[PDB]
Amino acid sequence: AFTFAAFCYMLTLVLCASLIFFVIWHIIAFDELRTDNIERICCLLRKLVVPEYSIHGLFCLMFLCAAEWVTLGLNIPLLFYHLWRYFHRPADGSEVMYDAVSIMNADILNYCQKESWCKLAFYLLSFFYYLYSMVYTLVS
């Protein structure tokens, strides 16, 4: 029984499989920072920030329309986190955030390294959670 909410699970599996691929360059370019060039990785990783956040802004709009009050709750602290991680940080004001070319300041490399294995944690088990609630609705 194909429903509208079941399409909202098929669409996010198309998109969150790229959202794990956004944050695989989160950890590999940090691996290039720990082995070493800085303004190269600054100019790269600054770009793909508003994509990895506003795609998450899509789903919080989406499951509201899908009227899934479970899965709307299971990502709304991350949207609260994506908003909070944003708005203090573009005080530099070059394009968006996440590098601020003098990134080599202490304690911000490891705090973003916390976030490196935080996104790769959250996006992965949710990817199998959207595939869970896909098959839940699609053959019910």
Partner 1 sequence: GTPVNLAVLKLSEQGVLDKLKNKWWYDKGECGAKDSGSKEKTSALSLSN
| Lookup: tokens for 116 | 């490196």
Using the rule CB under 8 A, is 4 a contact of partner 1? yes
Using the rule CB under 8 A, is 7 a contact of partner 1? yes
* Residue 91 DSSP class: G
| Residue 130: Cβ-neighbour burial (10 angstroms; 0-12, 13-18, 19+) | buried
In the chain, count of helices (H) and strands (E)? 6, 0
- Report in angstroms how near the CB of residue 48 gets to partner 1 at its nearest: 34
**Residue 136 interacts with which of ligand PCW, partner 1, none, CB < 5 to 8 Å by class:** ligand PCW
- Report in angstroms how near the CB of residue 93 gets to partner 1 at its nearest: 46
Residue selected from 3, 4, 17, 57 as contacting ligand PCW according to rule CB under 6 A: 17
| Residues in contact with 93: Cβ distance below 8 Å, sequence separation at least 6, in sequence order | none
Interacting residues with ligand PCW (CB under 6 A): 10, 13-14, 17, 128, 131-132, 135-136, 140
Interacting residues with partner 1 (CB under 8 A): 1-4, 7
